[PDB]
Write a protein that binds this ligand. Structure first.
Ligand SMILES: O=C(O)CSc1nnc(Br)n1-c1ccc(C2CC2)c2ccccc12
Ligand SMILES: *[C@@H]1O[C@H](CO)[C@@H](O)[C@H](O)[C@H]1NC(C)=O
Length: 515
């Protein structure tokens, strides 16, 4: 196949522009996933009460602090209660002789008249729109889990459709679906409808993610392929900073979702000027069209040797890859070789731990640091050197020590974040950023490592099991926060424990770096 690329250019203008065009789309795709740190930010909130809020009433000399003491009981955080109010104004709390036990729980009622939300940071959020608070607290992580389950289902559906219809066609319509469904969610009338449209948006996110990487590799010479995939991975690192920058300017959830959805109408349009893969076209017995794509690429690269692309040269080079079709295989085969049985388990575990920890932590930055814009920016900025240093280390020290060290350090940083006292918010922010950086480095390490642990017959089946494990763990990520009602440290303890246990397990894997 690489002879056709050499007659067409395996690295050059076309590959450069293709890499740029796909990197930008991956940045915006990353913004789509990270959006609910801001679109679904929780404002500080309290019950609606007549004295505080019915401004049509008779004015008085009492200042808002006294009215807040008189109207709403204190809560766990040494702050006003977010879900209860006094049944009648408690004037007896105003005197200096008052005490904390001067009232009883029977004197308090829930927010019958609704909530009042802080508008200083955000104009609106889905939490404030649909009151995803108090008894409905679980609905935010439920929405995030529904999005990630959409990604799981979409990745399941993508493969067969990509093989049946082609990488570029499915990528094109995935772009269109992302644009439509992102626009539709921004105007949703109700919470279930918003969840439906976020699920259908993730369904297309999965296809974009898969077909972008596939369409890059199938047009890139093996010499440049690793660098190209590395740049594809850095697109998300820049997507984090892009999310912080865009969300800083747009403080309204509708406008934010709409703004991050519009770009995909442009991605849809310029996806038509891309060529379909010639490998896929020849494999499907379509040399008449593969030739057209090949000479399109050669024309872009300014390469004259399309004159030598007599159609037979296609039918005598790529044709015989179809020999691989004689033996389809399944996930269950991985565990039928006793030498691979344990290897498979402790690799899939690392994939699961990566996805679980990353989407446990990165989707509630509001719990990890005071300022979420700067914190998002930093989990973007640190991710870059983390990934590239992972590449450097595994190119020098090998795969096993790099994966083990990254996972262990990430887990131990996240555990420390619980141990550092709450007042030292700067150090907690730094440690959270370092933990997520270790998780990203572990993503790099496991992606490269899993492509080497298994025999050629099974490499892609093993990697598929790994990727599906990562998506399944990402689904469980958000739901662990429901443990937070028992204590703020418990979800973080779980998120820190999982990577430690998986990084200890990674010490048992065999090495694959060339000697
Ligand atoms: O959430 C899941 O379903 C499973 S992990 C997932 N899903 N979509 C994406 Br984007 N990722 C991703 C999550 C995290 C990262 C960086 C390394 C920390 C990624 C880097 C490149 C590509 C995808 C990534
Ligand atoms: C608000 O105060 C006005 C004062 O006249 C009163 O008429 C009205 O019923 C009050 N509404 C509520 C909801 O308390």
């Amino acid at each position: 196949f690489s002879e056709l690329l050499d007659l067409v250019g395996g690295l050059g203008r076309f590959q450069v522009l293709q890499t740029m065009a796909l990197m930008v789309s991956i940045m915006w795709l990353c913004t789509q996933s990270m959006l609910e740190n801001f679109s679904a930010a929780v404002p500080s909130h309290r019950c609606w009460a007549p004295l505080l809020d019915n401004s049509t009433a008779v004015s008085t000399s009492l200042s808002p602090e006294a009215l807040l003491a008189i109207s709403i009981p204190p809560g766990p955080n040494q702050r006003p209660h977010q879900c209860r109010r006094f049944r009648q104004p408690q004037w007896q709390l105003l005197d200096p002789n008052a005490t904390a036990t001067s009232w009883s729980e029977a004197d308090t009622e829930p927010c019958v008249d609704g909530w009042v939300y802080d508008r200083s940071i955000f104009t609106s959020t889905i939490v404030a729109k649909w009151n995803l608070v108090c008894d409905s607290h679980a609905l935010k992580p439920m929405a995030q889990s529904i999005y990630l389950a959409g990604i799981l289902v979409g990745a399941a559906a993508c493969g067969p459709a990509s093989d049946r219809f082609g990488r570029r066609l499915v990528l094109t319509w995935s772009y269109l679906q992302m644009a439509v469904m992102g626009t539709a969610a921004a105007f949703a009338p109700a919470f279930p409808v918003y969840c439906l449209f976020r699920f259908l948006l993730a369904f297309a996110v999965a296809g974009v993610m898969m077909n972008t990487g596939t369409l890059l590799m199938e047009w890139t010479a093996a010499r440049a392929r690793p660098l190209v995939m590395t740049l594809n991975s850095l697109g998300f690192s820049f997507g984090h900073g892009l999310t912080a920058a865009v969300a800083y300017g747009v403080r309204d959830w509708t406008l934010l979702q709409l703004v991050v959805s519009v770009p995909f109408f442009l991605c849809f349009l310029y996806s038509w000027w891309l060529p379909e893969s010639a490998r896929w076209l020849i494999i499907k017995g379509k040399p008449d069209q593969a030739l057209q794509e090949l000479r399109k690429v050669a024309r872009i690269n300014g390469h004259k040797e399309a004159k030598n692309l007599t159609i037979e040269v296609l039918m005598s080079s790529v044709k015989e890859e179809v020999a691989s079709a004689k033996e389809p295989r399944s996930v269950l085969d991985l565990f039928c070789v006793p030498g691979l049985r344990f290897r498979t388990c402790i690799s899939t575990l690392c994939w699961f731990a990566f996805g679980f920890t990353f989407f446990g932590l990165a989707l509630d930055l509001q719990a990890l640091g005071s300022n979420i814009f700067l914190l998002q920016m930093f989990i973007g900025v640190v991710d870059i050197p983390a990934k590239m240093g992972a590449l450097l280390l595994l190119s020098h020290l090998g795969r096993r020590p790099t994966l083990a060290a990254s996972l262990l350090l990430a887990g131990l940083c996240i555990l420390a974040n619980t141990l550092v006292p709450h007042e030292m918010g700067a150090l907690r922010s730094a440690l959270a950023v370092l933990g997520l950086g270790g998780v990203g480095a572990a993503f790099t390490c496991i992606t490269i490592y899993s492509s080497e642990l298994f025999p050629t017959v099974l490499r892609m089946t093993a990697v598929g099991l790994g990727q599906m494990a990562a998506r399944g763990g990402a689904i469980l990520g958000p739901l662990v926060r429901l443990l937070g009602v028992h204590g703020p440290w418990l979800p973080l303890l779980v998120y820190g424990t999982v990577p430690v246990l998986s990084g200890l397990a990674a010490l048992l894997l065999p090495e694959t770096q060339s000697l």
